[PDB]
Write a protein that binds this DNA or RNA. Structure first.
Length: 104
DNA sequence: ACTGTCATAAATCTGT
DNA sequence: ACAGATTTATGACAGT
């Protein structure tokens, strides 16, 4: 089928059709760049991504900003998932980039 | 209201 | 153990 389908993993559920993020069946709220970065991470758990890979996928290939736009948006995404208990999935690889994980 | 940039603090790696 | 160089986290502000 071509209709989109909800992703539910480790108590966190994201619906691409409704643009709706919920943790433990209680909603969380975020902007659309934050949602797209979260959608990219939840479709790719257990892989390391540099700020360049995140820029080409989420912001766009021919779109231009500094690398440290990613750092501020990572803080905004963690701040958003923090009262939902799910900031700790979003992990940091020093000197390279970031990684998303179920636990470890 | 949402995203991009800068400033300062904390954290990491290597050399002595 | 401490200092210097490089990276990352956080808070405030501007532009559109």
């Amino acid at each position: 089928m071509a209709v989109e389908e909800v992703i539910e993993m480790q108590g966190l559920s994201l619906d691409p059709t409704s643009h709706r993020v919920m943790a433990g069946e209680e909603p969380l709220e975020m902007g659309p760049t934050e949602f797209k970065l979260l959608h990219f991470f939840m479709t790719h758990p257990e892989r390391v991504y540099s700020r360049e890979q995140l820029l080409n996928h989420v912001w766009g290939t021919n779109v231009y900003v500094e690398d440290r736009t990613v750092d501020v948006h990572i803080r905004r995404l963690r701040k958003a998932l923090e009262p939902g208990g799910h900031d700790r999935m979003v992990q940091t690889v020093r000197g390279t980039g970031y990684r998303f994980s179920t636990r470890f």
